[PDB]
């Protein structure tokens, strides 16, 4: 069991859990302040999966190979974005950072000869794109259309791969 | 809108999130160290009940009536209980604290002339009684088995009342 | 981004719409001229994989990461293989030169720590087994039987696994 | 069998291949760069279309009256039109031109009483006039909404005659 | 075709047939000495896995690549276990050898280039951690109970993931 | 319990368990090298057969009666047969010493008042002449024709009576 | 008709109708007196079975090669064993006299000749070891648990082979 990869998926525990917390309030926001409540279901679906099987899928591999989970979470809302655009803008620039912890776990299993945990690794790599995608998707829509109610009429759409999940 | 209930109610929040964190990683321990898969998949329910509705509940109440969400989350799991029945023993005491503070919620509407808020927060009084008898009837199988399976197996048809929910 | 790898799959990309073009005319001869329908529609089958998704995956992929899509197109059949076993026995060939073409992508992907091009690659690699041991199950049945008949009952079948799709 | 008609399908075989590909390339552009899925979707479909039966029922043709298949393909997409406007406009004077090519082949099956050609290309007749009105009726929406999103909606339900096919 | 790979996976063939044999013993004595007929079907499971596709997808995969099958079997059970903790404890034993053999095999197609066998021994990977948990779940189950058919009780419901299968 | 009962049994495991390691060998040689995947399959069904029921069987009778069983397997595939018929042939000289094997025990059933063993045994004594007539059946299709693909196309037949089973 | 066989058969009637009534009793006192009301029930099956089909193919055997049949029963419960391991103990000691009785009959049938009765009592031969089988099961839940219930619970579920039965 090796501790580099134990502490960076405990690293990666650790930024599910807040950020699922982060894109609940941008879920409330959307909703409440920016008037889209179809942005905010998107939002809130982000938040329930980072939530979810994002930190599960974690825990449960510590209980077959034998790596310690730490509960250690700290997250703060203090600024929220200016208007609905910027939001969802800020989901996906977050999101990047994802792909860019996710690919540095990976490199982190083969340097270690960490297999199951290369293996492991594979579905966030994958999902790692899907989401960034799909909050691509909804940033695209402000960019074509000025009309609010027809974002969230595209947006609604969307709510109700072979490769890519 | 109460400004004294948005903040309690923003105490609320924050205490669901906290407590269905510290409960996953109770369920992860339940499991894994205690050997006890049936007690976390029990642990794991009540973690996602906090960090669903009993959160999602309140935020939905404030695009309503006009409050402000707070998200200031921080919990840190610095020590586990020493074998699966002080673990549940002190679900039990968490939960208890619920009940405390929901009623100081029920009291603070009143006074404050907020019947609103008085009827929302009937379903917090109410599911804190029922959240307190199901792990209630967890802690006290083991005050009647020596047995872990014995335990285990009567905890899993636990997860396979017109008052109480 | 990477570019090299940006490159490589550009490179891919040709390869399939190019020898999905081969196969399509190899298909029409395998009929007419070689008198074997069934051998003809295994052909124009491998074709439509080699036209579909083969070069579906890779503009996908584009279109989430970033890279760039080049069409360039060049390929005439200026000549036909003699009989219907020279020309299924061209086919395997063309597959073979397949998989080294995507080892080089996987073994591209690594050293650039392209983990999602690793990843998407994999389907490549094990698509390219597959595709080879398809055609080769054809490639064997012209050592077995001097009877193109015979043959074409049996590629007939063929056309009415866990690790390699 | 006329090796003039034998010589325009074996043309005509050519800019099916040719168009197909960059309708492919096309489609990959609306939704990566012009952000128009649906659009696209609606380029990918007469991609297929042309790489599809447009040339198939030439080869099966070939197949029963002697003709010979001639595989020669050269194709670069070295510009794209600056915005989606531009770009389905650019497919449908492509379409345009395919009814000029197609009227060539029935005149000329007439001239060398080529019957079973010219019965041969009613089909390609009439196939002309219907890909070029759903191109048209693409065209069209840009010239009646500034919104790319209502653009993208009314197309979506295009995707979703006993004369025209 | 890498000789190295072809030995590494003759010897992982060899492990499985041999693996199987003994847990064959192993379950008979599970039910016969030890009268824990569940844990013997349970271990019975285990030998018609290693048995079955264990060594059927090493030989799949020799006829596609081109690998030679080697067939040479010594295995004797001179020794059995004195309890059933022990027995099943011998079992984990043994799968924790199969992920060192299995780790070994994954490092050696990277090194050699070998990226279908890399591929075709993720499977491997996986499984190899399955196996193991599934091992572990009824280890467990001795440490805690005293009563052998509180246990027999329990592996029958066991016997009666998205990542690991 | 009779000794040489015991003795035999454990010898007629050892047979069907080294038997059907060298037809799963035998198998796979049917179809990579002799290129009759249909072959290999009733040759992979011959040996689940020796490897399941006809080793369980006995192990089963001996929890019943209190025999003792031993495991001890070599076996080594050091010359495969030069081609496809002598192949099966090869299996159908192993089934013939199969009911000479399984005469002996009924012999020794008799002399011993084993009268449970000889009807245990009578289940072999009908399978060693069904098991045999099948391979028969096979051996004899190398007779009949020279096309390798007419007899893998009965074979293939075969794969998709009151005394005999 | 052999007078030996007569009479070797009249006492295996006369043994399975006074086993039967004992079995009976047996079954009255594991409930009434032991308090294990499913330990009665699968003794009072096998009383059931003894004095059924096991008396009945008897005499419908004799009906048809011109045996006589005999009615002469006497049978006395003057002591129960004292506790239920031992009562389920001493029903396996008379199981296990079956066997020995089964065995003449048949070594009977062989030096009379008398293939009819040889195959008639190949059916008793195998009933003999598959009710010895089902006793044994149960006698060996009293060496496992110390606890009746656990016990009675997993004999309700043995209430609730080709070879044998
Ligand atoms: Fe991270
Ligand atoms: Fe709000
Ligand atoms: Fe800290
Ligand atoms: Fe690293
Ligand atoms: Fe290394
Ligand atoms: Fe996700
Ligand atoms: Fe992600
Ligand atoms: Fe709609
Ligand atoms: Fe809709
Ligand atoms: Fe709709
Ligand atoms: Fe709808
Ligand atoms: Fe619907
Ligand atoms: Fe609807
Ligand atoms: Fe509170
Ligand atoms: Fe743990
Ligand atoms: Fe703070
Ligand atoms: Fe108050
Ligand atoms: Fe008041
Ligand atoms: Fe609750
Ligand atoms: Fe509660
Ligand atoms: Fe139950
Ligand atoms: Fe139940
Ligand atoms: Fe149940
Ligand atoms: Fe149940
Ligand atoms: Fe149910
Ligand atoms: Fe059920
Ligand atoms: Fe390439
Ligand atoms: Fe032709
Ligand atoms: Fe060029
Ligand atoms: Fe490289
Ligand atoms: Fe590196
Ligand atoms: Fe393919
Ligand atoms: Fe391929
Ligand atoms: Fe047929
Ligand atoms: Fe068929
Ligand atoms: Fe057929
Ligand atoms: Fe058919
Ligand atoms: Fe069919
Ligand atoms: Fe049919
Ligand atoms: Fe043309
Ligand atoms: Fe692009
Ligand atoms: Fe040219
Ligand atoms: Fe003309
Ligand atoms: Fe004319
Ligand atoms: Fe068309
Ligand atoms: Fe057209
Ligand atoms: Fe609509
Ligand atoms: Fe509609
Ligand atoms: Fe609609
Ligand atoms: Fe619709
Ligand atoms: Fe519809
Ligand atoms: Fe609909
Ligand atoms: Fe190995
Ligand atoms: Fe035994
Ligand atoms: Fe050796
Ligand atoms: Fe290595
Ligand atoms: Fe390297
Ligand atoms: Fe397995
Ligand atoms: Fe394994
Ligand atoms: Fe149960
Ligand atoms: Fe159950
Ligand atoms: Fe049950
Ligand atoms: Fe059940
Ligand atoms: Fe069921
Ligand atoms: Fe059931
Ligand atoms: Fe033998
Ligand atoms: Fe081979
Ligand atoms: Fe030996
Ligand atoms: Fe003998
Ligand atoms: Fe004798
Ligand atoms: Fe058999
Ligand atoms: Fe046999
Ligand atoms: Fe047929
Ligand atoms: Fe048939
Ligand atoms: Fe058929
Ligand atoms: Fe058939
Ligand atoms: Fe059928
Ligand atoms: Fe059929
Ligand atoms: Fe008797
Ligand atoms: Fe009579
Ligand atoms: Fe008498
Ligand atoms: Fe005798
Ligand atoms: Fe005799
Ligand atoms: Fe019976
Ligand atoms: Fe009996
Ligand atoms: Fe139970
Ligand atoms: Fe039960
Ligand atoms: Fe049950
Ligand atoms: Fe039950
Ligand atoms: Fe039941
Ligand atoms: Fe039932
Ligand atoms: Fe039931």
Same mark, same amino acid.
């Given at each position: $069991?090796?501790? $580099?990869?134990?502490?960076?998926?405990?690293?990666? !525990?650790?930024?599910? =859990?807040?950020?699922?917390? =982060?894109?609940?309030?941008?879920?409330?926001?959307?909703?409440?302040?920016?008037?889209? /409540?179809?942005?905010?279901?998107?939002?809130?679906?982000?938040?329930?999966?980072?939530?979810?099987?994002?930190?599960?899928?974690?825990?449960? !591999?510590? $209980?077959?190979?034998?790596?310690?989970? +730490?509960?250690?979470?700290?997250?703060?809302? +203090?600024?929220? /974005?200016?208007?609905?655009?910027?939001?969802?803008?800020?989901?996906?620039?977050?999101?990047?950072? =994802?792909?860019?912890?996710? +690919?540095?776990?990976? $490199?982190?299993?083969?340097?270690?000869?960490?297999?199951?945990?290369?293996?492991?690794?594979?579905?966030?790599?994958?999902?790692?794109?899907?989401?960034?995608?799909?909050?691509?998707?909804?940033? +695209?829509?402000?960019?074509?259309?000025?009309?609010?109610?027809?974002?969230?009429?595209?947006?609604?759409?969307?709510?109700?791969?072979?490769?890519?999940?």
């Amino acid at each position: $069991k090796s501790n $580099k990869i134990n502490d960076a998926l405990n690293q990666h !525990y650790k930024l599910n =859990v807040e950020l699922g917390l =982060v894109y609940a309030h941008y879920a409330h926001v959307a909703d409440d302040e920016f008037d889209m /409540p179809y942005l905010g279901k998107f939002i809130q679906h982000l938040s329930e999966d980072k939530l979810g099987v994002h930190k599960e899928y974690i825990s449960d !591999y510590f $209980k077959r190979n034998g790596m310690k989970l +730490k509960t250690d979470v700290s997250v703060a809302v +203090k600024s929220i /974005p200016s208007d609905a655009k910027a939001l969802i803008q800020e989901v996906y620039a977050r999101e990047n950072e =994802v792909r860019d912890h996710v +690919k540095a776990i990976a $490199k982190l299993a083969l340097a270690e000869d960490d297999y199951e945990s290369f293996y492991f690794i594979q579905w966030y790599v994958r999902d790692g794109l899907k989401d960034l995608t799909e909050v691509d998707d909804v940033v +695209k829509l402000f960019n074509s259309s000025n009309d609010k109610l027809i974002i969230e009429e595209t947006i609604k759409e969307m709510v109700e791969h072979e490769i890519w999940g």
